């Protein structure tokens, strides 16, 4: 049941409120602006937005990590 070594946590998906405005920046006029990068390959669609890493960009499915 319980071991002497303490239990380690798992990567649980937490609750984030209104994450889409973190991507689509609401500007003044009626025009959409995208800050985070997208996957340029034709394997996955443009609607999937890739990860915003501080030194690179992580592809969503193909793991094609783009470096500066």
């Amino acid at each position: 049941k319980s071991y002497t070594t303490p239990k380690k946590n798992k990567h649980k998906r937490k609750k984030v409120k209104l994450a889409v405005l973190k991507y689509y920046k609401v500007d003044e006029n009626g025009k959409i602006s995208r800050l985070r990068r997208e996957c340029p390959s034709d394997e996955c669609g443009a609607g999937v937005f890739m990860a915003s890493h501080f030194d690179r960009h992580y592809c969503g499915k193909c793991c094609l990590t783009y470096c500066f």
Partner: protein
Amino acid sequence: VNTALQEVLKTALIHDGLARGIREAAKALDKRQAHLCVLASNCDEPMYVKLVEALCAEHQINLIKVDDNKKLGEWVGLCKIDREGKPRKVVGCSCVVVKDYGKESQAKDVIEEYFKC
């Protein structure tokens, strides 16, 4: 017209052609597949309505206004538990877009006459 819109929503639920949720709606607009949508105005959303109107006012998207976010959870069927009666545990949603493939219906002529004119 509300009966026709509910029939369209029900047959979109039957054929599973609708893209429920703001994530799938943003996917549909980024793939340019926004035909009809429902917006709930006069709500308690502080700044979400500006983003929803900004995405809805982009390219050939219908402008339909309803009253509440929590009244749209029963037509889409987010938490329609105990279908023989009234649900007791339910959450809400802002907008659910539809991408209907079986467009041919009975009142769809009046629907497209109202949408075009």
